């Protein structure tokens, strides 16, 4: 690919042999950093990794309730009790055919859109006493959480075979702006104090939140209208607690989204044509603890 | 930078698009440049206008992206006849060094008035230092389109005369000069000497003899 | 408020620097953006370049190894210095006040507005022309009338280079004044003409004389006018 920038994506061309074989074109379309490295010639991320396939630009990622049940003479049983920590013996267990309406939510470091709690909120592990055990933290009152993609993108439809059609990143029209999302100062410092009361009742001393120690890890990735963020979470755990404003993230997007098994394939997220603005409920949290603090 | 002419008529609206439509959000303005002359400051922010500029100059805002930029000046004067220049700022295109092409406005229709020709003879100094001229001045006509005829005695002259294009006028009108340059000899052995301006369709004399 | 007024040469050879200078009028010479734009016959205006309140440097990249614009807050005065002048840069010099404005299309924090520039008041205009030829003053000869109204004026001939400024009774009468533009005549000298429309009866006498200036000739002279 032959790339220049804009101001981040590349703008690149590239030759490619179209629905007739032996005719050769030459396209271009914008690709995100992320999705290209240089060999300036450049190429897409994966290329020397694994197949990518477009996803079929009709099929939605949206998280549907999805109800779990169990066969004919099988049961699911349930446990009622509004504060049951991870494990242990349930007091008030009922029996269900099948789970409630559960949503595949595949997130990260930010719970999306989940089961909140009753009464106060828990916070789950196994031996929290092993820092190599994650933790996993259910609020009982869900802090906003606001995401877009300003830039009013434009989709290209590019004939490379037979019915094989790609779509592109044509180019930006108005404004270039910032990918990025919002959460109330003070919704999440209340709600960050309520994560700070239990981790108290685990433990004593002093609470500090502090960032991340391939950047699907590092940062609060998900998926909003259909492309996948990833916000620099930086500016949400940073505070150490002792005994208007909005919250933003910078978040960069990317188009070609890996596998997580061990060198197979990879997937294309097809451009979203207009702007992308989301709205979530951030009601869990995944944690990891690490002197006197 | 080249010019894009405009006709609008005299009491009507000018619609002045601009020639370097925005690709993000703007911040344009307008200038009003009278050749040789200061220019004005129109419109600054793609709406706002300064202090002692008449409300009709409006200038479009950029609330929905999509809407060009466009001047518009209801009611048209006399006076308004300059150049308009467009600096466009918008987030995607750089830094903008240069103004806008040109929009030069030419208001139609127009009261016509009549030149008044004003020729005197050669002054007592410079013929004293051997060198003569008559200056035929001719102001305040309209259109600002004259052709100058010299006549010495009857015959036309057309050798060592030179001509200002028309001006115009603090009062809109114009004016323009014609020099006529004789030697001491050749003013003295003629009768008579005219000049005739022939603004329009008619052709006004003013002529001057050696007394 | 605020005015400005420039004043420079008016005539520089090719190849040297074209030094110039403006004053500023009841505001603060280092509190406000200054710009300095050009406009030569056959072209549009062009903008040069500006300082700032900070004395930053910043010009017009087609000259923009050319220029120089400085400041000295002393006064209310800063110059330009253009150099290796030619033909081309013939041109009138304006001196205007430029002010900031910050258009904001995004987050104030990411980075998204742009800043853009916006003279709202202007000095007058200091003709420059650059030619080798030499400086040259004119020479006024009156032009006297002939008789209820009647007019009379004074010709300015065969000066270099444009303009020349003329008054009438040092500045006391000034109706009926018309000065008119000058005429490049074919041996390189200009030509002008003023002439003021008068009662008849002033004729027999109320005195009249023209104050005629070039200032790239060091020359004020006057002149009667009568019958
Ligand atoms: C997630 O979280 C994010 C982070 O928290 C959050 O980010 C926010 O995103 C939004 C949108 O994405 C951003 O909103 C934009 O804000 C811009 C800035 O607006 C501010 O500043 C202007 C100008 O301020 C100067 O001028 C005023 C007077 O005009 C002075 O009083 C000021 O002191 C100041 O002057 C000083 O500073 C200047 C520097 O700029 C110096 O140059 C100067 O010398 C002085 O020193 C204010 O007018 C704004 O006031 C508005 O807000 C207050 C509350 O504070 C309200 O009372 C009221 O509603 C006011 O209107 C504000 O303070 C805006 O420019 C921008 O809106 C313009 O642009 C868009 C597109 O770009 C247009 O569609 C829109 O119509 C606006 O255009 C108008 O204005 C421009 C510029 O003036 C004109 O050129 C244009 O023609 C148009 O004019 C028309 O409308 C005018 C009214 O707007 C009217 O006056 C005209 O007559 C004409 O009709 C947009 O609103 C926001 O900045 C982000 N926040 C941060 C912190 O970055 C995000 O929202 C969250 N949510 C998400 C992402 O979902
Ligand atoms: C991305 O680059 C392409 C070139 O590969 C740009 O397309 C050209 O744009 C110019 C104007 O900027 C036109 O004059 C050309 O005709 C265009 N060429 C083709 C083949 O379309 C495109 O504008 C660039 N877009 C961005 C957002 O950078
Ligand atoms: C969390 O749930 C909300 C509400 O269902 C989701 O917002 C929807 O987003 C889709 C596509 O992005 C739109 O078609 C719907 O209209 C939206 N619903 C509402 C009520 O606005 C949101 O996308 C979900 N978040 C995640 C990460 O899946
Ligand atoms: C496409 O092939 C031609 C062959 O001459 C080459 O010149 C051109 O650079 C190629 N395009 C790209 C983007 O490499
Ligand atoms: C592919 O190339 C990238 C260069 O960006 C490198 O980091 C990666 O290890 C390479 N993978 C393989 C399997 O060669
Ligand atoms: C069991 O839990 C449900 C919901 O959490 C509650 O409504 C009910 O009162 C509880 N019953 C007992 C016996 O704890
Ligand atoms: C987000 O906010 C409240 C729950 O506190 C609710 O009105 C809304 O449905 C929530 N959205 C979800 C759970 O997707
Ligand atoms: C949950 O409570 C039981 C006792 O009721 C306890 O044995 C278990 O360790 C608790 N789980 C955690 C993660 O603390
Ligand atoms: C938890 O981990 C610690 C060491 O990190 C170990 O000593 C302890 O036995 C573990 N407890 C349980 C219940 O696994
Ligand atoms: C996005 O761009 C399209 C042009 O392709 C335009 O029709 C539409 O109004 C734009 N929408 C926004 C929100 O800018
Ligand atoms: C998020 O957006 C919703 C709807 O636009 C709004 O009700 C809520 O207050 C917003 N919260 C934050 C933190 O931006
Ligand atoms: C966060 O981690 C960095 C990396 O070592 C460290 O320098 C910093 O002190 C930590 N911040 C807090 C608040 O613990
Ligand atoms: C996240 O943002 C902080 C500043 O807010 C920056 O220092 C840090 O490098 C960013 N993290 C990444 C992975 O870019
Ligand atoms: C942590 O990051 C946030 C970003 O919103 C910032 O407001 C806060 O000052 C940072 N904490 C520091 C610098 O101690
Ligand atoms: C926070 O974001 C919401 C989302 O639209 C917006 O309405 C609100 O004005 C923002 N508040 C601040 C202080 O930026």
């Known amino acids: 690919l032959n790339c220049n920038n804009v101001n981040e994506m590349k703008n690149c061309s590239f030759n490619v042999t179209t629905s007739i074989r032996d005719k050769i074109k030459k396209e271009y379309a914008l690709f995100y950093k992320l999705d290209v490295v240089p060999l300036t010639n450049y190429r897409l991320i994966n290329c020397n990794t694994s197949v990518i396939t477009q996803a079929c630009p009709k099929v939605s990622f949206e998280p549907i309730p999805i109800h779990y049940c169990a066969p004919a003479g099988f049961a699911i049983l349930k446990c009622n009790s509004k504060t049951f920590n991870g494990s242990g013996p349930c007091t008030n267990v009922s029996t269900v055919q099948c789970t409630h309406g559960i949503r595949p939510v595949v997130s990260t470091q930010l719970l999306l859109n989940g089961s909140l709690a009753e009464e106060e909120i828990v916070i789950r592990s196994e031996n929290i006493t092993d820092n190599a055990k994650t933790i996993i933290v259910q609020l009982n009152e869900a802090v906003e959480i606001n995401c877009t993609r300003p830039n009013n993108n434009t989709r290209k439809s590019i004939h490379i075979g037979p019915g094989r059609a790609f779509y592109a990143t044509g180019d930006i029209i108005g404004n270039i702006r910032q990918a990025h999302c919002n959460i109330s100062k003070a919704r999440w410092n209340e709600t960050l104090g309520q994560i700070v009361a239990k981790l108290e009742e685990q433990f004593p001393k002093t609470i500090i939140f502090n960032h991340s120690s391939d950047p699907e890890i590092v940062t609060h990735s998900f998926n909003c209208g259909g492309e996948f963020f990833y916000c620099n979470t930086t500016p949400l755990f940073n505070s150490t607690w002792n005994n208007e404003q909005n919250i933003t993230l910078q978040c960069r997007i990317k188009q070609i989204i890996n596998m997580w098994q061990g060198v197979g394939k990879a997937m294309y997220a097809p451009p979203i044509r207009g702007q992308i603005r989301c709205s979530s409920n951030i009601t869990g949290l995944l944690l990891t603890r690490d002197n006197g603090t | 930078s080249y010019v894009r002419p405009l006709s609008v008529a005299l009491g009507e609206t000018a619609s002045i698009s601009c020639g370097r439509q925005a690709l993000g959000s703007r911040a344009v303005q307008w200038y009003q440049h009278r050749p040789g002359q200061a220019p004005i400051l129109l419109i600054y922010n793609n709406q706002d206008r300064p202090s002692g500029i008449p409300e009709r100059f409006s200038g479009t805002p950029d609330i929905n992206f999509g809407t060009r930029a466009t001047l518009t000046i209801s009611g048209v004067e006399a006076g308004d006849e300059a150049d308009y220049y467009c600096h466009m700022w918008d987030s995607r295109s750089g830094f903008s060094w240069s103004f806008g092409g040109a929009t030069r406005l030419t208001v139609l229709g127009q009261p016509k008035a009549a030149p008044s020709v004003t020729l005197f003879p050669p002054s007592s100094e410079e013929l004293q230092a051997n060198k003569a001229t008559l200056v035929c001045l001719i102001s305040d006509f309209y259109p600002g389109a004259v052709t100058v005829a010299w006549k010495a005695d009857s015959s036309p002259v057309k050798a060592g005369v030179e001509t200002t294009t028309p001006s115009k006028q603090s009062n809109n009108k114009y004016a323009a000069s014609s020099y006529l340059s004789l030697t001491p000899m050749q003013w003295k052995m003629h009768k008579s000497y005219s000049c005739q301006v022939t603004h329009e369709g008619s052709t006004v004399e003013k002529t001057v003899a050696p007394t | 408020q605020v005015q400005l007024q420039e004043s420079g040469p008016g005539l520089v050879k090719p190849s040297e620097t074209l030094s110039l200078t403006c004053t500023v009028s009841?505001?603060?010479?280092?509190?406000?953006?200054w710009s300095w734009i050009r406009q030569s016959p056959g072209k549009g205006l062009e903008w040069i370049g500006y300082?700032?309140?900070?004395?930053?440097?910043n010009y017009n990249p087609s000259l923009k190894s050319r220029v120089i614009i400085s400041v000295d807050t002393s006064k209310n005065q800063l110059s330009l210095k253009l150099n290796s002048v030619t033909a081309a840069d013939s041109a009138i010099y304006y001196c205007?006040?430029?002010?900031?404005?910050?258009?904001?299309?995004?987050?104030?924090?990411?980075?998204?507005?742009?800043?853009?520039?916006?003279?709202?008041?202007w000095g007058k205009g200091t003709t420059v022309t650059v030619s080798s030829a030499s400086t040259k003053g004119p020479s006024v000869f009156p032009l006297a009338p002939s008789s209820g109204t009647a007019a009379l004026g004074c010709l300015v001939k065969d000066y270099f280079p444009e303009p020349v400024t003329v008054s009438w009774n040092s500045g006391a009468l000034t109706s009926g004044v018309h000065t008119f533009p000058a005429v490049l005549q074919s041996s390189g000298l200009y030509s002008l003409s003023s002439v003021v429309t008068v009662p008849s009866s002033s004729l027999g006498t109320q005195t009249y004389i023209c104050n005629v200036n070039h200032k790239p000739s060091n020359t004020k002279v006057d002149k009667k006018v009568e019958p």
């Open positions: 300082i700032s309140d900070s004395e930053s440097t």
């Open positions: 205007a006040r430029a002010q900031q404005g910050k258009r904001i299309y995004g987050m104030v924090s990411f980075g998204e507005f742009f800043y853009y520039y916006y003279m709202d008041v």
């Open positions: 009841g505001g603060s010479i280092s509190n406000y953006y």
